[PDB]
């Protein structure tokens, strides 16, 4: 019942390919980023979102008005 | 000259798959028996199983005695030490009418 | 950071006495469910978001450049032959998802990088973490306000619960009325 | 006898635990602590000791079942009952004779 | 050997066959075979074991309550 | 693929048995007796037995021996005990009531269960 | 002859009649300590295990909530299937 | 069960219900019979193997209890024996 | 009460019968040790064999710590504990199955995922198309409307993977029922031949008399009874590691030729270029 | 609580005992450790010879 | 139609016997091992030491069916009824 | 395991390679395609070329389709013996008992 490993390929042969280190010459592509202001809107959505699904704790619905 | 031999069973632990082996083995088997043995023999709605001649023979060194009911006695006493404990009335169960969910 | 307290009780409560579950308490509890799922996703987007905050063009090429997502099955080789991939079979082999579309806007965007570690993550695990714990936490509480503002046997339980009462006298309290009003005691 | 070789009567008592109260004062202690504390619902803590315990109690209040399980409410061995025609309906009106 | 899920390719890039060879009919046939296979045999079996059941299912639950009346 | 390990001695297998002989010519060696005192029932025929000249070697492990030689046989008039209770037993005079009442280990017992 | 199949009453139906005979075994107890005389702390001896049986039954009959009814549970009824309406997720949202 | 559950039905539908037509035109006919013969199962035993072949016994169990409540109603027996069966409202 | 969920647990004596068998490691000392070294560098090369090799000598030499318990320290639970399936299958069995898994964890459970995401192993995987559907498509197979029935499918690859890991727990049961088969069966047998003689000598008085010798039959009956045990302890033992070898861990075949160096005392580096 | 009945206390005597056999006490491994100790104990303190003059 | 259940008590004990016919089949089979580690060693007494493994190897998985074999005869009787 | 290993080995080289043989043979202009451009803003794509990704995403991808998927898979095997078996009808909650006023 169940197969072995000798009916099966290794860990060898899954994940053949060892490493490389792959590097390229800097033209200049990562300057002049742009949207200098995007993680202060980015923030004040993510406080935004958690502002209109806050929820505080109202105990004093409990209270013995009977 | 340090050593985690001498001087650290955490780090020894830690650098050694061969001591986390008795552990892993350890919780497997508390799983096994909470999962399968613990409900269906050692809870109290099924330790009369121990009595049965097939699945428990001879749990008690002998065939179970029935007209003694040890089981029932001690059981029964342990109830009665905890009705004497909380102080609660025996025949309140008896004034209950449950109703039926019609339709 | 008081409501899950009585809350704990109260699920026991209702765990044993199951059978006096309403479908106004049965939807309170759905809704609850779904808050609780939606705060996973949640919790995935602040995650991807604060590390993308803190990613480098390299650790996002990572991400975005088939050379980085096909080390698992093809050679390196086949990427350093150049001619043996067109730039459309490049093109289907980039991933197109919404996480791929906003790392390729990123790119043009300005942001604090640090090196590929603890704290690329930590800055994403902490908004996620705190995502998560509110919902959940917010979640909790509206479910024991609508509880309190039930008018049933676990709205009552909870009722009595928040006045301050130990759990033990609630159940008998609570059970004293079952007896009577719902059950019918002879 | 070889059975008896074959038996361990090597016991000493039996251990009863209420699971339930141990489980009462397990949450009992949770609470202590986190009260003691003053810990917040964003701490590992809370997390942890609370976070499971409402999952597994939310799921199991939420279970809308159609039907219980399979060994439970079918799948169960019935004696045939008596039919309304042929032998079983003759012995009900023979039985129903014999008793008036 | 005769490994699971596994082919040996010769220089030519074809699949050396193990037990049968199958590339002498057309690859009109073959496509026509292949277009509706996948790498999936068990899971069929199952499915098709379902719908049977499912067309035999019972509906005594819902004579009982008067469905088929 | 392709390591080229040379043969290791050590995994051969050219002395377990020898070591094993060894060991047993040990044993036998104890079992050296001189002729004075020496006296052996053959059987019927004439030919030895076959534990009978092996147990001068057994007890001289039990002279070399320092305490199993003073207590394993304390066990010994357990046997006799039972000799002489199942002797005592196979005639015992019993109430034929108390029989028909309480039977030992009889079926179809419903006190029993069965 | 015999056959297997659906049980014959409800599970509430069930454990309501199993709570009856438990209260009457618990009753007839409670009677037959009456006529021998007993106090409370020997009722209590006598009749724990009878009202331990009762309270069991009691916590069943408590703990078995009968199904609400909605489109996805009459969709399951229609397609002859144990399936819970109040999962997301099935067997998963055990762990989830 | 995507397929199962929300495609097979529209396609099983029709060959469920020829079945179910005919084992009530069979449960009639038995009955009918049997109303005839007064209960006797010894003339209608064609009958009686067509409703054993084409009705479930799920269905003729309740189709039993029924005839049970039917002959208490017109009398020709009080107090039916109902040990094994569904006693459902 | 209604809260009080009541359990019984039965105790009896453990503590000290299980402190001997940490003790007597210390006199025994690992004797197996060499055999289990032999085993282990015929059947696996990598740097964690010390790791498999502790566990496997800590579960057999538990394992022959009871067995002689068992046939000398007769008291108690030393008697039963041989003759029982919970021992057999839990601590016994449980402990071989797991040890890979806690050893080499990390690649088998690797292994695992990666082969839910099914595909056909190439040799000598030189084509193009077949990366294309492996990245587009995910798999060299056809996924056209498998979606449809991913439900099933999930589960379905999860067993297609642990397909080749199954027989490991498979084997492990078979030889602990084995194990406690064999002993159970032979101690009843062996057993019940005795009483039978028994009744015969004691219905004949004649013969109720140490017939073969005090110290013969006891002497026969011990090496047997070693003799018996030990065989299949080796079996049990030798056939454990030959599976453990033959399905396991022919997996974690990574045979490096070694490449000779050339530029040792220079290194490029993205300096010398940029 | 804890509990000790008095039925597990009980008389007790070696007369009462039923005993064992010639086989059951063979059986019992008792007659192989009164060999095998002065085996074990021969093989070790004959192993180490002590220094000697032949004559 | 008509229902009689009938429980036949004396196949907890022909079963018994008729599983018993089968235990000695395979002792046929567990002496080839010995005789084939015999005459493997009478054509080379050297090769007696590597063989010696495969014959102890050969001997308890031959044995061990007949104890399957015997388990069930042994498993009819004293637990069923 | 059976001896069609090579059977079924041989019937999945045939399917692979042939699809193989169809994609050389249609060549390119795939991404001009209507298929191309609906894969790639359908969520089945993106998750099946997400499995395969380095970085632990194939355990993520098996996880979630698990999590997703693989439940309610259970659920169906074990419903297929369930489809069959006569079942009772569902006693529906009669949704009376649990109105409590408030006090
Ligand atoms: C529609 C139906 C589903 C369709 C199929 C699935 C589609 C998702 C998908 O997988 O596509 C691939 C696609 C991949 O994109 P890609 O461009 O190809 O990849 C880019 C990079 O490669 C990515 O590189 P990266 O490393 O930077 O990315 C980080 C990584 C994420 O970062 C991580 O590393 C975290 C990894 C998390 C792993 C999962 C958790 C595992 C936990 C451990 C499990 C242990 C086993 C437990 C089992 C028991 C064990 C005994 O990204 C992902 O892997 C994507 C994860 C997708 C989120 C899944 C969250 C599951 C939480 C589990 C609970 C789910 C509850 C149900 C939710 C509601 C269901 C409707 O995923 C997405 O992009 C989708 C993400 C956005 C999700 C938003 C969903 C819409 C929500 C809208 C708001 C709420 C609803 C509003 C109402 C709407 C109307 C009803
Ligand atoms: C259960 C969860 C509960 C969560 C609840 C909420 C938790 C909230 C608070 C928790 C905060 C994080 C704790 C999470 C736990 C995990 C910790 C962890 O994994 O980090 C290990 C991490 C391991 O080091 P590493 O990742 O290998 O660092 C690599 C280097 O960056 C080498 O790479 P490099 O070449 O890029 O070097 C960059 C260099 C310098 O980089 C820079 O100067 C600029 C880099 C861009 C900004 C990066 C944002 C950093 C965000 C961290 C918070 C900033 C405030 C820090 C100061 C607050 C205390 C005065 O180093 C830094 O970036 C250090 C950060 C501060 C730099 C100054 C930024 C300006 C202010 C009109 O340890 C750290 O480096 C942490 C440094 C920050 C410690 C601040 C602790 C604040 C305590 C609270 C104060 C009240
Ligand atoms: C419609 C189809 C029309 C086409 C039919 C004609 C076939 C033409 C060839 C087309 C290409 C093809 O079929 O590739 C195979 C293709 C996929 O088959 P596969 O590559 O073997 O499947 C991959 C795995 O082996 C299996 O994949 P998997 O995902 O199903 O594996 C999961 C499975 C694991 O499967 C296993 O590994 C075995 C484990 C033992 C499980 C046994 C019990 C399972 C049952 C319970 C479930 O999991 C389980 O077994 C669950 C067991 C859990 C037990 C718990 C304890 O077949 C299909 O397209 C499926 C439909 C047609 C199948 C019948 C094929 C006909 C065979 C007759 C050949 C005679 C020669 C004909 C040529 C001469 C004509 C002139
Ligand atoms: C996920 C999408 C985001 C959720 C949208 C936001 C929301 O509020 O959720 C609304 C909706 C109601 O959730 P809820 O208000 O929190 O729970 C109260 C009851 O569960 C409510 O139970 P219900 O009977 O009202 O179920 C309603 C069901 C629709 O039910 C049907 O239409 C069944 C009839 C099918 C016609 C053919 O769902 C929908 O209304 C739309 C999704 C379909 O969410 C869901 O029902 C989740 C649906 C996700 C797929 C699960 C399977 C749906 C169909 C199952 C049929 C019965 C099972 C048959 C076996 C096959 C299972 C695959
Ligand atoms: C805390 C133990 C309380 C006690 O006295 O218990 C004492 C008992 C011993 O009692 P006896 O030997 O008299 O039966 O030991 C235990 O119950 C400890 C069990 C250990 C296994 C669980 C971990
Ligand atoms: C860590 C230290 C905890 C501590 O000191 O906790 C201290 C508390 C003290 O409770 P009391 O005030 O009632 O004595 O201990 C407990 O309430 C029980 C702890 C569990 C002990 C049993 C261990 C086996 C688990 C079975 C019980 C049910 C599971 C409960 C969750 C674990
Ligand atoms: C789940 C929604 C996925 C939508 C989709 O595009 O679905 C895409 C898939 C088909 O994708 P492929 O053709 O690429 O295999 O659709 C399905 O498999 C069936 C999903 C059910 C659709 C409703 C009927
Ligand atoms: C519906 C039929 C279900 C009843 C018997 C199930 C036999 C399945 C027949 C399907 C044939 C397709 C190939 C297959 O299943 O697989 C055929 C299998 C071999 O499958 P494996 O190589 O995966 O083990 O043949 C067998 O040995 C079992 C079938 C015996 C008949
Ligand atoms: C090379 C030999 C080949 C022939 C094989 C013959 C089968 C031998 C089986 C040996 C295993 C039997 O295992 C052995 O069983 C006996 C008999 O119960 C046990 O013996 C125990 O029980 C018996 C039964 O009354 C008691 O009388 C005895 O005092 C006690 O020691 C041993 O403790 C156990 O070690
Ligand atoms: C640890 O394993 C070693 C145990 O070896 C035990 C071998 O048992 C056999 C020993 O019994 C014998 C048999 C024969 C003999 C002697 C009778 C050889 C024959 C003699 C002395 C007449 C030549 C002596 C002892």
Same mark, same amino acid.
């Given at each position: 019942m169940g197969g072995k490993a000798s009916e099966a390929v290794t860990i060898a042969f899954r994940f053949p390919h060892r490493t490389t280190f792959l590097v390229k010459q800097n033209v200049g592509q990562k300057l002049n980023k742009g949207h200098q202001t995007f993680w202060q809107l980015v923030a004040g959505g993510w406080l935004f979102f958690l502002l209109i699904n806050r929820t505080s704790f109202k105990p004093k619905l409990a209270a013995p008005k009977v | 000259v340090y050593t985690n031999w001498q001087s650290s069973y955490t780090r020894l632990f830690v650098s050694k798959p061969w001591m986390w082996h008795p552990l892993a083995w350890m919780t497997l088997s508390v799983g096994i028996w909470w999962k399968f043995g613990k409900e269906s023999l050692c809870n109290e709605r099924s330790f009369y199983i121990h009595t049965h001649p097939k699945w428990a023979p001879h749990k008690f060194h002998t065939v179970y005695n029935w007209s003694r009911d040890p089981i029932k006695w001690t059981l029964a006493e342990q109830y009665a030490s905890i009705i004497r404990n909380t102080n609660t009335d025996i025949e309140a169960v008896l004034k209950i009418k449950l109703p039926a969910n019609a339709n | 950071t008081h409501a899950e307290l009585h809350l704990f009780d109260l699920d026991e409560f209702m765990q044993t006495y199951k059978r006096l579950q309403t479908r106004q308490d049965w939807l309170i509890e759905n809704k609850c469910k779904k808050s609780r799922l939606f705060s996973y996703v949640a919790a995935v987007?602040?995650?991807?978001?604060?590390?993308?905050?803190?990613?480098?063009?390299?650790?996002?090429?990572?991400?975005?450049?088939?050379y980085v997502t096909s080390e698992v099955r093809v050679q390196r080789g086949a990427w350093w032959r150049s001619g043996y991939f067109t730039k459309e079979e490049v093109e289907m082999m980039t991933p197109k998802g919404p996480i791929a579309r906003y790392y390729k806007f990123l790119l043009g965007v300005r942001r604090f990088p640090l090196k590929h570690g603890a704290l690329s993550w930590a800055c994403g695990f902490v908004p996620a973490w705190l995502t998560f714990t509110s919902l959940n936490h917010w979640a909790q509480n509206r479910r024991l306000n609508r509880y309190l503002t039930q008018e049933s046997v676990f709205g009552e339980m909870a009722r009595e619960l928040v006045r301050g009462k130990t759990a033990d006298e609630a159940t008998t309290s609570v059970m004293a009325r079952v007896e009577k009003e719902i059950l019918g005691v002879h | 006898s070889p059975n008896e070789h074959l038996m361990f009567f090597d016991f000493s008592s039996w251990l009863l635990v209420d699971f339930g109260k141990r489980w009462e004062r397990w949450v009992s202690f949770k609470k202590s602590f986190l009260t003691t504390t003053r810990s917040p619902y964003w701490s590992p803590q809370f997390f942890l000791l609370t976070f499971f315990q409402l999952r597994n109690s939310n799921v199991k209040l939420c279970e809308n079942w159609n039907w219980a399980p399979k060994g439970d409410d079918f799948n169960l061995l019935h004696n045939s009952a008596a039919e309304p025609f042929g032998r079983d309906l003759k012995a009900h009106l023979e039985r129903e004779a014999g008793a008036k | 050997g005769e490994l699971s899920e596994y082919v040996e390719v010769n220089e030519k890039g074809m699949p050396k066959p193990q037990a049968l060879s199958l590339w002498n009919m057309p690859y009109a046939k073959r496509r026509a075979l292949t277009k509706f296979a996948r790498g999936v045999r068990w899971q069929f079996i199952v499915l098709f074991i379902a719908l049977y059941n499912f067309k035999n299912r019972d509906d005594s639950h819902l004579l009982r309550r008067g469905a088929y009346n | 693929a392709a390591p080229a390990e040379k043969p290791d001695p050590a995994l051969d297998a050219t002395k377990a048995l020898p070591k094993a002989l060894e060991e047993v010519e040990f044993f036998q060696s104890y079992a050296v007796r001189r002729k004075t005192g020496f006296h052996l029932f053959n059987r019927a025929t004439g030919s030895p037995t076959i534990?009978?000249?092996?147990?001068?070697?057994?007890?001289?492990?039990?002279?070399?021996?320092?305490?199993?030689?003073?207590?394993?046989?304390?066990?010994?008039?357990?046997?006799?005990?039972?000799?002489?209770?199942?002797?005592?037993?196979?005639?015992?005079?019993?109430?034929?009531?108390?029989?028909?009442?309480?039977?030992?280990?009889?079926?179809?017992?419903?006190?029993?269960?069965? | 002859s015999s056959y297997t199949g659906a049980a014959l009453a409800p599970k509430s139906e069930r454990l309501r009649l199993a709570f009856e005979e438990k209260q009457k075994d618990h009753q007839k107890?409670?009677?037959?300590?009456?006529?021998?005389?007993?106090?409370?702390?020997?009722?209590?001896?006598?009749?724990?295990?009878?009202?331990?049986?009762?309270?069991?039954?009691?916590?069943?009959?408590?703990?078995?909530?009968?199904?609400?009814?909605?489109?996805?549970?009459?969709?399951?009824?229609?397609?002859?299937?144990?399936?819970?309406?109040?999962?997301?997720?099935?067997?998963?949202?055990?762990?989830? | 069960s995507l397929p199962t559950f929300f495609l097979a039905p529209?396609?099983?539908?029709?060959?469920?219900?020829?079945?179910?037509?005919?084992?009530?035109?069979?449960?009639?006919?038995?009955?009918?019979?049997?109303?005839?013969?007064?209960?006797?199962?010894?003339?209608?035993?064609?009958?009686?193997?067509?409703?054993?072949?084409?009705?479930?016994?799920?269905?003729?169990?309740?189709?039993?209890?029924?005839?049970?409540?039917?002959?208490?109603?017109?009398?020709?027996?009080?107090?039916?024996?109902?040990?094994?069966?569904?006693?459902?409202? | 009460?209604?809260?009080?969920?009541?359990?019984?647990?039965?105790?009896?004596?453990?503590?000290?019968?299980?402190?001997?068998?940490?003790?007597?490691?210390?006199?025994?000392?690992?004797?197996?040790?060499?055999?289990?070294?032999?085993?282990?560098?015929?059947?696996?090369?990598?740097?964690?064999?010390?790791?498999?090799?502790?566990?496997?000598?800590?579960?057999?030499?538990?394992?022959?710590?009871?067995?002689?318990?068992?046939?000398?320290?007769?008291?108690?639970?030393?008697?039963?504990?041989?003759?029982?399936?919970?021992?057999?299958?839990?601590?016994?069995?449980?402990?071989?199955?797991?040890?890979?898994?806690?050893?080499?964890?990390?690649?088998?459970?690797?292994?695992?995922?990666?082969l839910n995401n099914y595909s056909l192993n190439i040799y000598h995987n030189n084509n193009k198309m077949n990366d294309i559907q492996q990245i587009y498509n995910g798999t060299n197979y056809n996924d056209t409307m498998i979606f449809f029935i991913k439900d099933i499918n999930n589960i379905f690859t999860i067993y297609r993977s642990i397909n080749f890991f199954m027989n490991w727990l498979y084997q492990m049961i078979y030889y602990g029922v084995r194990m406690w088969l064999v002993f159970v069966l032979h101690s009843f047998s062996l057993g019940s031949f005795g009483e039978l003689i028994t009744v015969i000598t004691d219905n004949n008085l004649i013969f109720n008399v140490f017939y073969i010798g005090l110290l013969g039959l006891g002497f026969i009956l011990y090496l047997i009874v070693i003799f018996y045990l030990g065989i299949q302890i080796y079996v049990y033992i030798s056939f454990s590691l030959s599976f453990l070898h033959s399905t396991i861990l022919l997996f974690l075949v990574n045979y490096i030729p070694h490449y000779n160096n050339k530029s040792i005392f220079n290194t490029f580096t993205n300096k010398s270029i940029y | 609580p804890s509990t000790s009945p008095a039925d597990k206390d009980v008389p007790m005597s070696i007369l009462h005992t039923h005993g064992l056999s010639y086989v059951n006490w063979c059986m019992s491994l008792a007659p192989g450790l009164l060999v095998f100790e002065g085996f074990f104990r021969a093989r070790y303190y004959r192993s180490r010879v002590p220094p000697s003059r032949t004559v | 139609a008509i229902a009689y259940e009938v429980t036949v008590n004396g196949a907890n004990l022909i079963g018994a016997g008729m599983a018993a016919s089968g235990v000695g089949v395979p002792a046929i089979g567990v002496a080839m091992c010995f005789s084939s580690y015999m005459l493997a060693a009478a054509r080379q007494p050297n090769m007696s030491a590597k063989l010696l493994p495969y014959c102890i190897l050969g001997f308890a998985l031959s044995?061990? +069916?007949?104890?399957?074999?015997? +388990?069930?005869a042994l498993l009819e009787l004293f637990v069923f009824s | 395991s059976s001896p069609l290993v090579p059977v079924w080995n041989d019937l999945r080289a045939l399917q692979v390679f042939t699809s193989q043989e169809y994609m050389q043979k249609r060549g390119p202009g795939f991404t001009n395609t209507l298929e191309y451009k609906l894969?790639?803003?359908?969520?089945?794509?993106?998750?099946?070329?997400?499995?395969?990704?380095?970085?632990?995403?194939?355990?993520?991808?098996?996880?979630?389709?698990?999590?997703?998927?693989?439940?309610?898979?259970?659920?169906?095997?074990?419903?297929?013996?369930?489809?069959?078996?006569?079942?009772?009808?569902?006693?529906?909650?009669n949704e009376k008992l649990g109105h409590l006023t408030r006090s």
């Open positions: - | - | 987007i602040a995650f991807t978001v604060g590390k993308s905050a803190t990613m480098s063009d390299e650790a996002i090429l990572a991400k975005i450049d088939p | - | - | 534990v009978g000249p092996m147990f001068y070697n057994l007890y001289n492990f039990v002279r070399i021996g320092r305490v199993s030689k003073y207590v394993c046989w304390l066990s010994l008039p357990l046997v006799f005990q039972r000799m002489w209770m199942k002797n005592r037993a196979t005639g015992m005079e019993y109430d034929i009531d108390l029989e028909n009442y309480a039977p030992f280990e009889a079926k179809k017992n419903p006190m029993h269960g069965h | 107890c409670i009677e037959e300590a009456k006529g021998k005389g007993l106090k409370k702390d020997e009722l209590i001896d006598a009749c724990a295990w009878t009202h331990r049986k009762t309270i069991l039954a009691l916590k069943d009959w408590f703990a078995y909530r009968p199904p609400f009814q909605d489109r996805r549970s009459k969709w399951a009824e229609y397609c002859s299937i144990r399936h819970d309406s109040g999962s997301w997720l099935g067997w998963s949202q055990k762990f989830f | 529209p396609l099983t539908e029709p060959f469920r219900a020829r079945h179910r037509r005919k084992c009530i035109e069979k449960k009639d006919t038995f009955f009918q019979c049997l109303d005839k013969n007064k209960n006797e199962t010894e003339p209608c035993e064609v009958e009686a193997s067509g409703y054993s072949q084409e009705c479930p016994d799920s269905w003729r169990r309740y189709f039993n209890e029924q005839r049970w409540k039917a002959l208490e109603l017109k009398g020709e027996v009080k107090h039916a024996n109902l040990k094994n069966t569904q006693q459902h409202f | 009460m209604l809260n009080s969920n009541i359990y019984i647990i039965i105790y009896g004596g453990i503590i000290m019968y299980s402190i001997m068998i940490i003790i007597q490691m210390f006199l025994y000392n690992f004797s197996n040790k060499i055999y289990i070294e032999v085993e282990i560098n015929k059947y696996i090369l990598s740097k964690n064999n010390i790791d498999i090799y502790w566990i496997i000598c800590n579960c057999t030499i538990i394992i022959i710590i009871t067995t002689l318990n068992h046939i000398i320290n007769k008291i108690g639970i030393y008697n039963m504990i041989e003759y029982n399936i919970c021992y057999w299958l839990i601590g016994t069995g449980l402990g071989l199955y797991i040890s890979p898994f806690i050893v080499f964890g990390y690649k088998f459970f690797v292994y695992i995922m990666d | - | 044995e061990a +069916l007949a104890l399957f074999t015997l +388990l069930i | 894969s790639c803003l359908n969520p089945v794509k993106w998750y099946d070329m997400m499995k395969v990704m380095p970085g632990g995403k194939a355990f993520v991808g098996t996880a979630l389709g698990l999590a997703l998927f693989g439940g309610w898979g259970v659920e169906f095997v074990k419903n297929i013996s369930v489809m069959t078996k006569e079942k009772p009808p569902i006693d529906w909650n």
